[PDB]
Design a protein around this ligand. Structure first.
Ligand code: HEM
Ligand SMILES: *[C@@H]1O[C@H](CO)[C@@H](O)[C@H](O)[C@H]1NC(C)=O
Ligand SMILES: *[C@@H]1O[C@H](CO)[C@@H](O)[C@H](O)[C@H]1NC(C)=O
Ligand SMILES: *[C@@H]1O[C@H](CO)[C@@H](O)[C@H](O)[C@H]1NC(C)=O
Ligand SMILES: [Mg+2]
Length: 325
């Protein structure tokens, strides 16, 4: 494993849809997944265009192409790699499971790519459906039209944090009413709120950086993995700034439906925004450990290295935990 890249030496706004990074359509076999950010980076060649990359490639791409901040890039990338990537080959698919990540570790590890439900990906996504409905990764036109509708009703036609606050809650209520397996606890509880800020913070041209995303740009990223022509990245590093506005609109407790629709039951063992270090500890002690309960020597070494890297991204002042000693 390579060391996590450091922050950008020069984090100014600049043209990122440039001659060295043209958009190209998918070739047969090219993988795209539930993340429009990574999808766009792959479709512009900031990441390998086949959608399989190393963690260091992913961190460099999100920083260079979008100005995602270093700590957020490290946390998200190593969390995804630990639960969805191949720790021996250092490869992660940004979408479906593929033999391109190499020989698989033993069960119960899945190495299922970012499409794997319940590890990183989860319910109440904005433009992707819940896994229970058949497809947790492809762009959904009905769901995007609802994002456009909420942008028209709360953002004057643009997506901003006010729209994020309303749409986030709508998608939660929709999942409670229709997905008997809806889960909204721990890691997904955090990412569901965080990801609603990214279109306002990172898909808005950095020469404006006004938090107002137009629907042409929104469709370009969410559906076609394509930067607008002449797109300038954000003018400074960021990730979740403004997530407080989304939470404040409709504060929620972590929980899940319990096998039936309209059965949302709070989980008092879940972490929440008052316990960010618990989210990290449960991710390592329960999610990662459940995939790798008794690893052999080479896997244990790779796990420990990637867990050290994950810890570098932990933003709360937290204590590191060591599931393999
Ligand atoms: C740094 C590494 C990253 C990783 C590992 C990652 C991974 C993911 C995954 C697995 C999802 C699916 C969560 C869900 O079920 O909705 C997701 C969603 C999302 N990501 Fe990323 N991502 C990263 C960076 C970024 C960046 C840099 C951007 C923007 C420039 C971005 C924008 C988004 C958005 C907007 C969503 C929500 C999609 C939706 O709900 O319709 N991500 N990401
Ligand atoms: C998209 O989402 C809508 C609304 O949840 C759902 O009815 C539909 O089956 C999904 N799939 C496609 C391919 O549109
Ligand atoms: C979103 O846009 C609406 C309409 O322009 C505005 O009232 C609201 O303050 C905006 N929210 C932001 C910028 O967070
Ligand atoms: C995680 O495991 C460590 C021991 O490795 C323990 O000290 C810590 O309390 C655990 N955290 C949880 C279960 O949240
Ligand atoms: Mg999802």
């Amino acid at each position: 494993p390579g060391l996590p890249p450091g922050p950008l030496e020069n984090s100014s706004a600049k043209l990122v849809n440039d001659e060295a990074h043209p958009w190209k359509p998918l070739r047969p076999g090219d993988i795209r997944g539930p993340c429009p950010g990574l999808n766009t980076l792959a479709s512009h060649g900031y990441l390998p265009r086949n959608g399989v990359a190393t963690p260091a490639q992913i961190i460099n791409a999100v920083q260079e192409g979008f100005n995602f901040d270093n700590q957020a890039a490290i946390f998200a990338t190593y969390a995804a790699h630990l639960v969805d990537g191949n720790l021996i080959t250092d490869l992660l698919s940004i979408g479906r499971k593929t033999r391109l990540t190499g020989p698989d570790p033993p069960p119960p590890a899945s190495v299922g790519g970012l499409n794997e439900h319940g590890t990183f990906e989860g319910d109440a996504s904005m433009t992707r459906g819940d896994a229970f409905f058949g497809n947790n990764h492809d762009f959904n036109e009905t769901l995007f039209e609802q994002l456009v509708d909420y942008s028209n009703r709360f953002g004057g036609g643009k997506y901003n944090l006010t729209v994020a606050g309303e749409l986030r809650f709508k998608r939660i209520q929709d999942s409670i009413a229709t997905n008997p397996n809806f889960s909204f606890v721990d890691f997904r509880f955090f990412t569901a709120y965080a990801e609603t800020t990214f279109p306002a913070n990172l898909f808005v041209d950095g020469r404006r950086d006004d938090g107002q995303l137009d629907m042409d740009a929104a469709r370009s990223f969410f559906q076609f993995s394509r930067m607008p022509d002449d797109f300038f990245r954000a003018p400074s590093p960021r990730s979740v700034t403004g997530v407080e506005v989304v939470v404040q609109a409709h504060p929620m407790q972590p929980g899940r439906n319990v096998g039936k629709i309209n059965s949302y039951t709070v989980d008092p063992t879940s972490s929440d925004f008052s316990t960010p270090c618990l989210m990290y500890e449960k991710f390592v002690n329960i999610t990662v450990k459940s995939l790798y309960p008794n690893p052999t020597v080479q896997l244990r070494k790779a796990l420990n290295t990637n867990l050290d890297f994950l810890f570098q991204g932990v933003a709360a002042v937290c204590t590191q935990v060591f599931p393999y000693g």
